[PDB]
Amino acid sequence: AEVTQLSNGIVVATEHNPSAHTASVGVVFGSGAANENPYNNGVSNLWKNIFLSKENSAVAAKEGLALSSNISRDFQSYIVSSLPGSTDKSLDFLNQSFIQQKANLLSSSNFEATKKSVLKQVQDFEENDHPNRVLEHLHSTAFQNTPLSLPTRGTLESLENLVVADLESFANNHFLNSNAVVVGTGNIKHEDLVNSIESKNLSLQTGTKPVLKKKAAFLGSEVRLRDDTLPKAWISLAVEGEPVNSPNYFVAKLAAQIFGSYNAFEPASRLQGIKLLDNIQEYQLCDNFNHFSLSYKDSGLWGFSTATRNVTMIDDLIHFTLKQWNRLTISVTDTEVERAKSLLKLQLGQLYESGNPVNDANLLGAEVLIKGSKLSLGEAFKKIDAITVKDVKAWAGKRLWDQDIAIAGTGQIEGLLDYMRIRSDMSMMRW
Amino acid sequence: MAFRKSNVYLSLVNSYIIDSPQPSSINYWWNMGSLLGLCLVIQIVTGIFMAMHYS
Amino acid sequence: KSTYRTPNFDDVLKENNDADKGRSYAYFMVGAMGLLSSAGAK
Amino acid sequence: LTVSARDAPTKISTLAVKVHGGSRYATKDGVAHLLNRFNFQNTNTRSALKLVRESELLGGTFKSTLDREYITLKATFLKDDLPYYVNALADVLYKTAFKPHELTESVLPAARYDYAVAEQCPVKSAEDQLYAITFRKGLGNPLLYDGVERVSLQDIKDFADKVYTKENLEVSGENVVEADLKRFVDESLLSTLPAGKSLVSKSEPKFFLGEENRVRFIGDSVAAIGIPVNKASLAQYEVLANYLTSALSELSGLISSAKLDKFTDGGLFTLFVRDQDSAVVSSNIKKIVADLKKGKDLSPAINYTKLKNAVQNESVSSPIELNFDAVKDFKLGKFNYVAVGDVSNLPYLDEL
Amino acid sequence: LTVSARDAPTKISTLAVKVHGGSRYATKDGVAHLLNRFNFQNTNTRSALKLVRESELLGGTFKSTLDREYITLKATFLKDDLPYYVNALADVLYKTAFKPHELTESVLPAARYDYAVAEQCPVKSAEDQLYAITFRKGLGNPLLYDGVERVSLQDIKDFADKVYTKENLEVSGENVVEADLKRFVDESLLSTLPAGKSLVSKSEPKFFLGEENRVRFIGDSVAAIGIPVNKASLAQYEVLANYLTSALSELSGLISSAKLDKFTDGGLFTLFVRDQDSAVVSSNIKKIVADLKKGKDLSPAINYTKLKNAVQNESVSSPIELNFDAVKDFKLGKFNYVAVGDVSNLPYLDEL
Amino acid sequence: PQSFTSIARIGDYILKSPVLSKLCVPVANQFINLAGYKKLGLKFDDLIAEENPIMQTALRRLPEDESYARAYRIIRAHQTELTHHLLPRNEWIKAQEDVPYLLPYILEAEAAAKEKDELDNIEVSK
Amino acid sequence: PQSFTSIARIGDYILKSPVLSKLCVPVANQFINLAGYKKLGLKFDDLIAEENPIMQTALRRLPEDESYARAYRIIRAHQTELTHHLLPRNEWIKAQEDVPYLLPYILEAEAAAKEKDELDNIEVSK
Numbered sequence A: 001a002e003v004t005q006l007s008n009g010i011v012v013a014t015e016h017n018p019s020a021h022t023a024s025v026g027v028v029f030g031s032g033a034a035n036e037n038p039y040n041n042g043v044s045n046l047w048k049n050i051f052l053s054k055e056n057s058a059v060a061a062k063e064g065l066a067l068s069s070n071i072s073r074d075f076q077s078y079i080v081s082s083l084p085g086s087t088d089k090s091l092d093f094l095n096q097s098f099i100q101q102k103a104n105l106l107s108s109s110n111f112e113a114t115k116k117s118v119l120k121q122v123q124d125f126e127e128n129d130h131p132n133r134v135l136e137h138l139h140s141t142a143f144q145n146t147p148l149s150l151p152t153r154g155t156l157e158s159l160e161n162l163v164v165a166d167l168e169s170f171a172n173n174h175f176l177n178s179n180a181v182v183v184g185t186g187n188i189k190h191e192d193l194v195n196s197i198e199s200k201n202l203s204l205q206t207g208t209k210p211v212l213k214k215k216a217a218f219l220g221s222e223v224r225l226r227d228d229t230l231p232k233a234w235i236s237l238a239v240e241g242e243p244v245n246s247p248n249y250f251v252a253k254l255a256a257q258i259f260g261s262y263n264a265f266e267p268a269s270r271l272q273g274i275k276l277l278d279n280i281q282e283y284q285l286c287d288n289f290n291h292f293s294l295s296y297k298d299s300g301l302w303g304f305s306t307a308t309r310n311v312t313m314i315d316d317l318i319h320f321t322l323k324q325w326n327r328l329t330i331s332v333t334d335t336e337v338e339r340a341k342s343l344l345k346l347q348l349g350q351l352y353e354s355g356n357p358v359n360d361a362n363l364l365g366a367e368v369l370i371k372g373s374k375l376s377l378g379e380a381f382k383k384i385d386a387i388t389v390k391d392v393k394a395w396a397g398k399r400l401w402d403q404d405i406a407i408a409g410t411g412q413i414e415g416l417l418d419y420m421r422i423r424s425d426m427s428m429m430r431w
Numbered sequence B: 001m002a003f004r005k006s007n008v009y010l011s012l013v014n015s016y017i018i019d020s021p022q023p024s025s026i027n028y029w030w031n032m033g034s035l036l037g038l039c040l041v042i043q044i045v046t047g048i049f050m051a052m053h054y055s
Numbered sequence C: 001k002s003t004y005r006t007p008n009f010d011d012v013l014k015e016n017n018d019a020d021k022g023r024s025y026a027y028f029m030v031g032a033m034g035l036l037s038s039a040g041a042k
Numbered sequence D, E: 001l002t003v004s005a006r007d008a009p010t011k012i013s014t015l016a017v018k019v020h021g022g023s024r025y026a027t028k029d030g031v032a033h034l035l036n037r038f039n040f041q042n043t044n045t046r047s048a049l050k051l052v053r054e055s056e057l058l059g060g061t062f063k064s065t066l067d068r069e070y071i072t073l074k075a076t077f078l079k080d081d082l083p084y085y086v087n088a089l090a091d092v093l094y095k096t097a098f099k100p101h102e103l104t105e106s107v108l109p110a111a112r113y114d115y116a117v118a119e120q121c122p123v124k125s126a127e128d129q130l131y132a133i134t135f136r137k138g139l140g141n142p143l144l145y146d147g148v149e150r151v152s153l154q155d156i157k158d159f160a161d162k163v164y165t166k167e168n169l170e171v172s173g174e175n176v177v178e179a180d181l182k183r184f185v186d187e188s189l190l191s192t193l194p195a196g197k198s199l200v201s202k203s204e205p206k207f208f209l210g211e212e213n214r215v216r217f218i219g220d221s222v223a224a225i226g227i228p229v230n231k232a233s234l235a236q237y238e239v240l241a242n243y244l245t246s247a248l249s250e251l252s253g254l255i256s257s258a259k260l261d262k263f264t265d266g267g268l269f270t271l272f273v274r275d276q277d278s279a280v281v282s283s284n285i286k287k288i289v290a291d292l293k294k295g296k297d298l299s300p301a302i303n304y305t306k307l308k309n310a311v312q313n314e315s316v317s318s319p320i321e322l323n324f325d326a327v328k329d330f331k332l333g334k335f336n337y338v339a340v341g342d343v344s345n346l347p348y349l350d351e352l
Numbered sequence F, G: 001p002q003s004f005t006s007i008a009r010i011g012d013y014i015l016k017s018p019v020l021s022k023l024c025v026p027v028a029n030q031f032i033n034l035a036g037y038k039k040l041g042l043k044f045d046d047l048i049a050e051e052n053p054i055m056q057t058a059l060r061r062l063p064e065d066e067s068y069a070r071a072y073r074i075i076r077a078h079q080t081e082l083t084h085h086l087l088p089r090n091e092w093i094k095a096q097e098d099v100p101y102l103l104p105y106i107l108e109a110e111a112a113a114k115e116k117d118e119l120d121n122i123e124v125s126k
Ligand SMILES: CCCCCCCCCCCCCCCCCC(=O)O[C@@H](COC(=O)CCCCCCCCCCCCCCC)COP(=O)(O)OC[C@H](O)CO
Pocket: A315, A316, A318, A319, A320, A322, A421, A422, A425, B002, B004, B013, B014, B017, B018
């Protein structure tokens, strides 16, 4: 169904859905990990863990309502799921937790307990999770000296530096009325439209969020977390992408979808696709493909992530993918364009209409904060049927033709060509 | 594996000319050897062209 | 000091805008290289 | 033949067919896993893999899943591709080829990789051994083919003949009107499949409690505990699992997982405690067993487990509605224990 | 300290030194095995080869074996060269070097190869599991170091300091003169080792009977049976084992091994049935366990057992005074079944 | 290089045509048994080239017994030709023992590869 | 290619003598810190060659921390020499920092090699 929005400082947006029967309500803030100086990165995740530390007992014992949160770059949200008849008590808990009282939550001993838990979690992430660590390092090395490269969970020193002063400063400078939007995804229709606009339901700090000076940039770079003890090799690539609210977002998404994903050990994924899959199937080269188009408010990131075990032929693995990108930017067949259209329609329908209201609420908040109104499935399909081979060619001429790239790798990367033999394979052939 | 490393002549050219893990502290002294090799080659070529019109 | 902090590069970074200008210089000088090499060989 | 669907204004459609035969009904050790890995390829009527590349070109995708008592073939597609996809599903659910020349090079490497991946994780191995000790060679068989027992093409074909029957089928779909699935299943190859007998058991399985196994695995020491649960009192163990895994209980930082598994006549309420060392594992499991045998109140979690169950139930095969009304108190009894990892230091069943 | 020997006119001499500390007394899993593999090399003064190659050049060789409760160092040499061998042997057992830079390239690969060899044999794994299940982490311990529990060099040095003492050591060896062997020990480094305490256990161990384990093994299948036996009645199980493994009984062509292990405080009586397929193993073990529990007169086997015992126990280290004079009847009670190989088809302890 | 599917098509065209097949089958078998490979103890499938990847794919699916027999026949042929001799009429392949044991795999692989390469480069025209 | 044991013998002979040590130790220190390798920030146990089997046997037994530090210092030296500069006056190694760490491995390995060589060709011992 269509969404309804209104705004008096606070914005109330609801996506009614009789199909589901788990009403949810939350608050999405427009400031995440992209609006914080590198002095102490780990503040947003610290707040998230604080919200996920002791109020869980309160919500479980008092009534029936489960709460969750997620912060990636600027979609800092605190969603509180519930039953259809318990939205009143859900908003009651939210009100009692985010305006008053706001002092007993920040107890000292609770703060050190949360700090220790977050330190353990970030250490575990650094030690174990390689596929996400390489992407985080790609983010760090793609936006050097800019509040868009610092990691979303911070560094060890950043967590251990500050205690309570900068946390409360962040709360006072980023938990405001200007960039706060409530969400009513679930099985509710109009009570959310009124309960948020109420005398008891107000947000503190009716001021303005501080504005940064240097917005964003992009410069090619390398990072080599070479840990040869690790068995496999994880590498990633990236090219300057496209931010949200641009009339090319779907074109970049389709360009990413054209090549698609691939898993070597899944027989179904081995028996489809495009020419590069056959080229890498002839001689075994890699195991995973993940063509991504990451989009944020300030800038974007369109690239490629993979993991391989045949450490000897990293150069061949990179060379084939770059040659296929060049083939895309020179000549595209219409059958692959049609199959990419169908696959993108399927994947976007799956993502935007999943059965879990939490993801739908997160997407609705991300759209409402920077758009003002959510774009429905039908309009997305209408705008994607107009994608043509000439449009894709023209778009790829500007973005994928002699543009800066950034590579992040770890594991056994001895055979990885440093920067010139990996960049000179774009416009140096018999064009 | 790329065709550049597949063809035997191209594979030899790549492994002996195009690709060679040379050290990263090379000064001009090491390039002096390749310069001398080129001088030897040009000397042979010019001598051959000299002897063609020689008695 | 974690590895997420890039070391100082401002002393060597290109402060000027228009990255195409450097690209234009590079490709123009590559073309000049090819031009002189071809003329000399001929 | 059971036929049903579901309709909603969402513009993405899902169709799934479930056959009531899996590793529980496998005659050999891992014949069911090989059948599932051999499922969606090599059809007689159309081609093998390219004639479904043209299917995914039309706006959808295919998937096959192996479970304890299900081999589900789900298809997700746009609102207009229902007839083609149902015809294709009926064509592949036809025990078509089972060609020996495309088994020693297509599904054995896949099954080997699956078994290796499942074996690397200690939790999956411990859970499998928990099933092995709780249930004998009835419901309890290895999900993933390892190689201890040899199987051939003829036995796979016999098992497919046993399972792929018209009577023992279940088809469901979302975002599809009831009427289209009412007819189109009848006017397709699926209605012309051989009519067998539903392998569904009319009686609960027999469980043996009080057993124990120990394995000298290398890695993270893992301790497990699993109680077999009948049908009469089945929501109590669900609310107990939600209570234990939540943050309301005083036991949250020392339990890796306390999930529950559901069947048509019962289930096995498992539990997991894991860590890299052994002293912490021993102390944690000892105090968990002690304060669970002592008895902890269970009423103040009914609303939370109701919410969790409601958000969980999105699949078609919704079980009997677990009325959470009659949940007052709990007292742990006889269970089954499995030790995995540095088993030399981990406590035994007697002194636990 | 205990020094003994026996005289013989033959011209080949045997020198053996016993330390009564082994895998039974090992603090960790495979510290004893690594110690023995690390035993005879790189003395603090005697190099590994520069002064051990001459021992081969002199006309003798050195050996170091391991058991459940014995790492014996045995030396065999020509008759007229005892003092040099006793000097070198006393030099080696002096906590000499234990270099951290020789463990990771010399004895670790040897232990790895030994474990690889012992793993492929189903009977050896059955024996290990049977010991570990009949006896807990006391006498029953993993005989070979496999890497389940981490062991450090400092732990090896501590274990060697604990075991290589004066009281926990015996020197013996036949084919050598008594008095001169008694004299060539005081003027040796062996007279200056620390005088610790004997590691021998005063009382019998703790035995748990009636348990069961199952291991999924690829290849041959074996079904073992074990009985814990004290010192009071140990000759009865010896005569039973010899009667079973001989050709006098009908249960002879199917049983693989019927060995028995004796310690200073009791022992364990194993039994084996192994074949390539599980079709015959199940019936074989069923009939063996069925007719064993029926009882069998056993006295028509005493003389053959005396002969066998005489021919196996020719060593100077004579066993206890076994007296085969009161064996008349036998009847099995409760045992500790173990299943290796295929697990699905081999029967269960309940109905066996 | 010549597709086996075309060979099968021409073969079935000939085999069911009465007069042409009656004219061409006796000369066909006479040519087969004057070819000479029968004397050397060779089956026909052992003669066709086994180099290009499709033939390798066909070989890799043969049951082990056929591969062992083929290897023995190749080795014996090499040894026999090395001495320029021919073993007498005891190793000679009988008239009806030269049955193609490798044709079905070849035909299946041909069909699969042909339809794969046809549908790989395809258009969306009606 | 010169044995380390002979150098150790000469050092032991010269250091223990009071007059020779007190007359030639400071001059040795000023030679070694005027050499130039301390200037770039390299420990002395890294400049020697790494191609003879003695070195290969030696640092194969080196602990993990020393090997990691050696690799870091080697790559930093390579980069610094490529850059045509010197490190600042804060990250160098002082006199106490250049502690010998590669000596005992060389001593033991070379003694083993020497006894191998002089024992393989032993005589009948007349
Ligand atoms: C009788 C001569 C007939 C034609 C000869 C053709 C070969 C010409 C070259 C002769 C030897 C020169 C020595 C160096 C050759 C290797 C050059 C090389 O490696 O450079 C590039 C390769 O250069 C080439 O040679 C590419 C072109 C292939 C040409 C094939 C034959 C064309 C024949 C037409 C005539 C060519 C000669 C014209 C002379 C004016 C590397 O880039 P890449 O694309 O291989 O790297 C990709 C990487 O993996 C990351 O993506």
